[PDB]
Design a protein around this ligand. Structure first.
Ligand code: FMN
Ligand code: A1A53
Ligand code: OG6
Length: 374
């Protein structure tokens, strides 16, 4: 598309001279007004992937934390992504930690963020998603695209489950899947919720709350779910990389026994100390410096779960091979974040071209044949 490249011109200017979040807000503004490029091409039927009954037309979506409020869904999905994970959201709106709270290092293709959970709140974000679903039923470029919702807790929330209830009971019928965020490093004591006992209780409650919306309705299931699948939203868990294996195997044993629908592996880390520009700066780091670390976590959990729980790759994906390495490790789908930051509009068209070519060269009939081939 000719107009993909114009935004690559501005991109270097932005990376070198403009504050990251200002660029991020700008990005969202362009999408709000549908001034982003489009990728209307048919996707390779050899790359169409699925997570249980959730059928992704291609294995690439946009990770959570990008459109934390669903004010930019149409445009981002129209860039060429098969799905998007909005959020993470909390019941009430938050302003997050103080700015500046996002810092890019172009040289290492790395990011550090101390955003917290700044969002417009569950209620208002739900209205934004309703607007989208009503446009989706009227736009053919969106008819097959999927929208998941990452959910979390407010800093002052006492019981995480209470916040999981409100959001599920408010937005569950419009979402295609729920992502359980118990892994953000920028919320105090949030990663202590990954202890097996409570995470078990967390998963069961999420599944239960989603299961409870179906019972009390007079309308059939078709008109209950105003989403893409017309089906109950699947439940995925978001995991942090900064854990020991004892914690990982505990989690793995739990999510098998509680029948989680999936697990997003992985999230940002606080243990990276090989970035000079981020010294004395709080938050979790994203990008290339997390690529290798995450892929190994996938292998671990993919093995700790005996391949019985699907995975959603997330961390350091920039190239088609980067994705394949994570696909061959056990991931069914991949999410990108830093890639959009450093590559811009050509992110989807680049990583989809690259992956198709590699699948062809490596001798694979389809993507599923590559799952766990390592
Ligand atoms: C500014 C920023 C905000 C983020 N917000 C969230 C979030 O709200 N919820 C979440 O689960 N992950 C969040 N993340 C983590 C990303 O979704 C992703 O897991 C991580 O950046 C790794 O992706 P990457 O290596 O491709 O950049 C955020 C990351 C950044 C940099
Ligand atoms: C998308 C994005 C997000 N974030 C933060 C959350 C981490 C950044 O820091 C970003 N920096 N850049 C360069 C981008 C992409 C971008 C923005 C605007 C424009 C143009 F419209 F001006 F051309 N082009 C490209 C960033
Ligand atoms: O999961 C998350 C959430 C955030 C955030 O502060 O919004 N930051 C991260 O690095 N990971």
């Amino acid at each position: 598309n000719p107009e993909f490249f114009l935004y690559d011109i501005f991109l270097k200017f932005c990376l070198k001279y403009i504050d990251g979040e200002i660029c991020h807000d700008l990005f969202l503004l362009l999408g709000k007004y549908n001034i982003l490029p489009y990728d209307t091409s048919n996707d390779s039927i050899y790359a169409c992937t699925n997570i249980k009954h959730l059928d992704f037309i291609n294995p690439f979506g946009v990770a959570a934390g990008f459109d934390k409020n669903g004010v930019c869904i149409d445009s981002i999905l129209k860039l060429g992504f098969s799905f998007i994970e909005i959020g993470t959201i909390t019941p009430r709106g938050q302003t997050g930690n103080a700015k500046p709270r996002i810092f890019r290092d172009v040289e290492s293709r790395s990011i550090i963020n101390s955003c917290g959970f700044n969002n417009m709140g569950c209620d208002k974000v739900t209205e934004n998603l309703i607007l989208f679903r009503k446009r989706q039923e009227e736009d053919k470029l969106l008819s097959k695209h999927i929208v998941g919702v990452s959910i979390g807790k407010n800093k002052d929330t006492v019981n995480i489950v209470d916040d999981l209830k409100y959001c599920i009971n408010k937005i569950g019928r419009y979402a295609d899947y729920i992502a359980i965020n118990v892994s953000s490093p920028n919320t105090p004591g949030l990663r202590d919720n990954q202890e097996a006992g409570k995470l078990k209780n967390i998963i069961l409650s999420v599944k239960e709350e989603i299961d409870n919306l179906e019972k009390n309705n007079i309308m059939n299931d078709e008109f209950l779910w105003f989403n893409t699948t017309k089906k109950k939203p699947l439940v995925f868990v978001k995991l942090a990389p900064d854990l020991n294996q004892e914690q990982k195997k505990e989690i793995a044993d739990v999510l098998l026994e509680t029948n989680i629908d999936g697990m997003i592996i992985s999230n940002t880390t606080t243990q990276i100390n090989d970035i000079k520009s981020f010294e004395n700066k709080k938050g979790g780091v994203s990008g290339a410096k997390l690529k290798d670390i995450s892929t190994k976590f996938i292998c671990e959990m993919y093995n700790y779960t005996n391949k019985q729980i699907p995975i959603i790759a997330s961390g350091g994906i920039f190239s088609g091979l980067d994705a394949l390495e994570k696909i061959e490790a056990g991931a069914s789908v991949c999410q990108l974040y830093s890639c959009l930051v450093f590559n811009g509009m050509k992110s989807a068209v680049q990583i989809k071209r690259e992956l198709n070519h590699l699948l062809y060269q490596r001798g694979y009939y389809n993507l599923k044949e590559a799952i766990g081939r390592k």
